Amino acid sequence: GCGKSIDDLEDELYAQKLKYKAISEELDHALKDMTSI
Amino acid sequence: GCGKSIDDLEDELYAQKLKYKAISEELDHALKDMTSI
Q1: Rounded to 5, what percent of chain A is helix, strand, coil?
Q2: Is A35 exposed, middle or buried (0-12, 13-18, 19+ CB in 10 A)?
Q3: Which residue of B has its CA nearest to A18?
Q4: Residue B22 in contact with residue A22, Cβ under 8 Å?
Q5: Do B17 and A16 touch (CB under 8 A)?
Q6: What residues bear Phosphoserine in this entry (chains A, B)?
Q7: Which of A16, A28, B30, B35 has the fewest C-beta atoms lying within 10 Å of its C-beta?
């Protein structure tokens, strides 16, 4: 075992990862779209 | 934190959470602050 719920951890984690990259991207792109005025 | 490499998991997790909301907001605000320049 781990301690409580590690499984759901890796799950929510991985998801948070793809969300962290999708967000980080959409973010940089969100600003890139506006270019450095 | 389990007993392998979950620690960094829970860390990156909770971080990804506060970072997810901090990014989401900082993002919207990042653009809101930018506005159609």
Answers
A1: 70, 0, 30
A2: exposed
A3: B16
A4: no
A5: yes
A6: 5, 24, 36
A7: B35
Q: Where are the domains of chain B?
A: 1-32
CA A36 to chain centre: 24
* Size (chain A), residues: 37
Q: Using what technique was this structure determined? A: NMR
Cβ within 8 Å, pair B9-A12 = no
Give the list of residues 6+ apart from residue A11 with CB closer than 8 angstroms, or none.
none
Residues in chain B: 37
In whole angstroms, give the CA distance from residue A13 to residue B11.
10
Shortest CA gap A6–chain B (Å): 7
Residue of A nearest to B3 (CA): A2
Kindly state the DSSP code that residue A33 receives in the 8-state scheme: T
